[PDB]
Amino acid sequence: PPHGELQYLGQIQHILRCGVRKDDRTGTGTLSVFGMQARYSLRDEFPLLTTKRVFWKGVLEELLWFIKGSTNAKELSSKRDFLDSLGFSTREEGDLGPVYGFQWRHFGAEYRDMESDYSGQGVDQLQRVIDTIKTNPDDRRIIMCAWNPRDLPLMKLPPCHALCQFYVVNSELSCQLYQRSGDMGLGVPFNIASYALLTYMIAHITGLKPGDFIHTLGDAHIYLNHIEPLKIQLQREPRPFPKLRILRKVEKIDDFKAEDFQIEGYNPHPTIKMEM
Amino acid sequence: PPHGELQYLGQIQHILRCGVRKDDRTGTGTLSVFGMQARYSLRDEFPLLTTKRVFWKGVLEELLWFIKGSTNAKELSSKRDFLDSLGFSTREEGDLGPVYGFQWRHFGAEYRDMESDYSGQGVDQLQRVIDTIKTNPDDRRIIMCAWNPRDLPLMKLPPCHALCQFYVVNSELSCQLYQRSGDMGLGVPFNIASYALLTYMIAHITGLKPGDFIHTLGDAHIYLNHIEPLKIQLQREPRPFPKLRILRKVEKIDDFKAEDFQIEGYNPHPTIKMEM
């Protein structure tokens, strides 16, 4: 049964062979393919890519900050145009505005500052997911969306960047992430690990077992400057994925802490430095 | 190069072989797989399935009614629980409430009745798509969403049922539809034809050529009562897809009429009656 990272590598190769030159907002050209999908088993394995070292502690710490609903850059620990819409003095103090996990936990709420009490304000998308999984696991609407923060100033009712759908059958929790664009070199590996981790978390608090992570892309692209390192990455053979262990029984999504998680059996190839 | 309908047939076969029993809101069991994708070329062909006759005039007429933004059932020509939320006398007169194409043309507007003037109210998702294609064809946000009408009474900020993303490169317009659930027997063939048609329309008014239609599903399912007819459908060999012809030059999406369209070379297998 073939290693799932083989799908990611096949996608990179497909884009290098059949992608077309397409310009992005940031000047930089890309090689682009529209519409792709890969499926990663979460059953007794965790799809942290092995053809280069992925910084999983960073992935974890950023996901926890998302889960908190924080809009304070200071709060994002050691592990873009949107800033122009902010005031100077609030920006200086680390206040990002109503972005990222604010949308997950207070979707539609009116933002005051990064220190305001938003309890009870807006839709808690994340708790809605967890609650639906418990009240009706057959539901087809177990959906959570994220917005690129730069979009929120630009227009009325901007589309999401990412739509994440959960699914339950036979005691297994699966997750499908649709992303309108994905950078294959940097973003995608990170997003895979990040949503796979979220799925492990939610499965843990709802008493289910992780099933599959399905990653679907709109504009799947490779920045011109990542072409040569990706060509080299394609020559590396994947190693069996590692396992992820959750180290205590946790009951609410807000109680998880970075120390609750351990990776084991992770044997990646060396780090590839890709330049944003 | 293999016939694209082969993908749809492979999906049906996959669900029959590997799908699991899953119950749906309507009682009825289904065989379910989470996460699938198929790609249909629109380049000099139109993916109207050939392994059974698809009612394309109905597909066309319903899409035109959507495009109109109509909420009047009477207006939907010859070719569910949500009604319970409506008043008796408005319902009787055919007024469906702020549903279907109302969302496409007046997203977020406050609904009065089916005869009110909504010009200038809400976000015109469809014109926004067309406008972005003309102002920035590289954009990754060329997105239009549809909601299952039954959801709008149920909750604050319900998720979409369908997210449709367009993409432009080299003078070609492609479309990806993500659907959170798809009934393989009835819904999917219809949705394929419907969004492929929309893509032809938009391409025509923006001066592009149709590229690919990508269909992505969350809960891809087969109702228990469709199993035996689908098993028989799987034994039929697809015939080359037909072509679609747009018969005059049309400039605005609202000007299209059912008579502007002709199918040619359509040689389907006989009709399969699938019972909703």
Curated annotation (Swiss-Prot), chains A, B:
Pathway: Pyrimidine metabolism; dTTP biosynthesis. GO terms for cellular component: cytoplasm; cytosol; mitochondrial inner membrane; mitochondrial matrix; mitochondrion; nucleus. The active site is at C160 (nucleophile). DUMP binds at R25, R140, R141, C160, H161, R180, S181, G182, D183, N191, H221, I222, Y223. Its EC number is 2.1.1.45. (6R)-5,10-methylene-5,6,7,8-tetrahydrofolate binds at D183. The keyword Membrane applies. Its main location: nucleus. Pfam families: Thymidylat_synt. PROSITE patterns: THYMIDYLATE_SYNTHASE. There is a cross-link at K252, K257, K273 (Glycyl lysine isopeptide (Lys-Gly) (interchain with G-Cter in SUMO2)). It is linked to Dyskeratosis congenita, digenic: A form of dyskeratosis congenita, a rare multisystem disorder caused by defective telomere maintenance. It is characterized by progressive bone marrow failure, and the clinical triad of reticulated skin hyperpigmentation, nail dystrophy, and mucosal leukoplakia. Common but variable features include premature graying, aplastic anemia, low platelets, osteoporosis, pulmonary fibrosis, and liver fibrosis among others. Early mortality is often associated with bone marrow failure, infections, fatal pulmonary complications, or malignancy. Homodimer. Catalyzes the reductive methylation of 2'-deoxyuridine 5'-monophosphate (dUMP) to thymidine 5'-monophosphate (dTMP), using the cosubstrate, 5,10- methylenetetrahydrofolate (CH2H4folate) as a 1-carbon donor and reductant and contributes to the de novo mitochondrial thymidylate biosynthesis pathway. This is Thymidylate synthase. It comes from Homo sapiens (Human). The lineage of its organism: Eukaryota, Metazoa, Chordata, Craniata, Vertebrata.
